[PDB]
């Protein structure tokens, strides 16, 4: 393989998904230049688990997945193995045995708008925790008591999603961060993604 992996499409994407509806790009049959990502001085977070970040260009994997979404600054710590909280429990969950890297950068200049950017959403209500790499896009009214809701937002009956409302004057912890999660999968199948 001589074609480069389309990591540009993921990291430089025009728009990013809401975390509850996180995007997944399946990357295969390509050569990846991972040192380009790690040599970049433009990332706030670059944490890898089960792989050393530098000595990564001479590894081959069956599939590489690139998940991407926007969360709060204060919530980036939840995109890690073994974490709990609103985002890890109800929006995007990494497995305990995660093999991959978590990459984040402040996107206040792109994803906040004056008076509030209500495009980006997170799930506030869910009965049970997500399994690793589970994506829940349902919009059913959340039942917090014994009586059914049937589509109306009232007492004990909550719309499950809420808006971040990113305003450019937000404190850093409330500012938007774009996140890319690279997971590396090694199955008993031909390895389609190698580095060079």
């Amino acid at each position: 393989h001589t074609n480069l992996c389309p990591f540009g499409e993921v990291f430089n994407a025009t728009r990013f998904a809401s975390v509850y509806a996180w995007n997944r790009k399946r990357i295969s049959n390509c050569v990846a230049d991972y040192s380009v990502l790690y040599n970049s001085a433009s990332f706030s977070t670059f944490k890898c688990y089960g792989v050393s970040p530098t000595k990564l260009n001479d590894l081959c994997f069956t599939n590489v997945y690139a998940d991407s979404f926007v969360i709060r600054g204060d919530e980036v710590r939840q995109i890690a193995p073994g974490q709990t909280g609103k985002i890890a429990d109800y929006n995007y969950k990494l497995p305990d045995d995660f093999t991959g890297c978590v990459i984040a950068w402040n996107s206040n200049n792109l994803d906040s708008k004056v008076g509030g950017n209500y495009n980006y959403l997170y799930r506030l209500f869910r009965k049970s925790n997500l399994k690793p790499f589970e994506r829940d896009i349902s919009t059913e009214i959340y039942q917090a008591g014994s009586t059914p809701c049937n589509g109306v937002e009232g007492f004990n009956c909550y719309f499950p999603l809420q808006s971040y409302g990113f305003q450019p004057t937000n404190g850093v912890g409330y500012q938007p961060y774009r996140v890319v999660v690279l997971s590396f999968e090694l199955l008993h199948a031909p390895a389609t993604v190698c580095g060079k």
Epitope: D74, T84, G85, K86, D89, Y90, G116, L124, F125, R126, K127, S128, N129, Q143, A144, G145, S146, N156, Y158, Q162, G165, F166, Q167, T169, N170, G171, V172, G173, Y174
Partner: antibody
Framework: QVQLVESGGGLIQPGGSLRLSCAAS????????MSWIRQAPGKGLEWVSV???????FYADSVKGRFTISRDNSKNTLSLQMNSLRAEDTAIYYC???????????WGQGTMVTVSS | AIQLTQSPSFLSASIGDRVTITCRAS??????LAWYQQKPGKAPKLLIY???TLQSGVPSRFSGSGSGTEFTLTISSLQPEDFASYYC??????????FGPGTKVDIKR
Amino acid sequence: QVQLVESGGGLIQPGGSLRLSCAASGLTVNRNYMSWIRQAPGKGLEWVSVIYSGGSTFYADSVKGRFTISRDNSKNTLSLQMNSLRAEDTAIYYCARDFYEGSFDIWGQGTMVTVSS
Amino acid sequence: AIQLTQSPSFLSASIGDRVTITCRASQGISSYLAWYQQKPGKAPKLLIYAASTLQSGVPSRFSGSGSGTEFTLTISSLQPEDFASYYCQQLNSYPAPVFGPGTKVDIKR
């Protein structure tokens, strides 16, 4: 008839233990963000602990390792186990339901906890 | 972490007065604020959440406003049951909820 009712407070020596309970009606404890909040005499509110519907629990730094929040689904109750109590834990303890990012709409009447030698 | 101030700490008012209480956040917190009322010996009572949404069952004379760092609670026409203390709360806060130091509204004479 929505209400929360705390119980189990009382007078205890430093180092002792108390277990608070909170009986809910009109909301399901294990489907809500349920918190304990306390208020020392003459002071303001201090959040103590929360349990998420999905089961995650979190604690104020000042009580971490000493208090444990739990719930009983069959009795629709919430509990707070308080070990290694200190004089500064003296407060009225409220249970409350969090319906939006910390907005507590339903409060119990509170139960008084007094820690003193 | 973010800190909340409240102004003024004490306010004297008469029945029928327009009353405005202010809460300041040390950094921008958008509309992540709630307001409570509390009287001696009683649990707090939620008045406003999301900076401006009136909690159901709260009289319409209560309103909140502001976004970012400056927030106000307004009582358009003060009623006898409104003499009380009032607290703001930073919502969706890390690592823990933060409460303002309060405003006590007493009876002017």
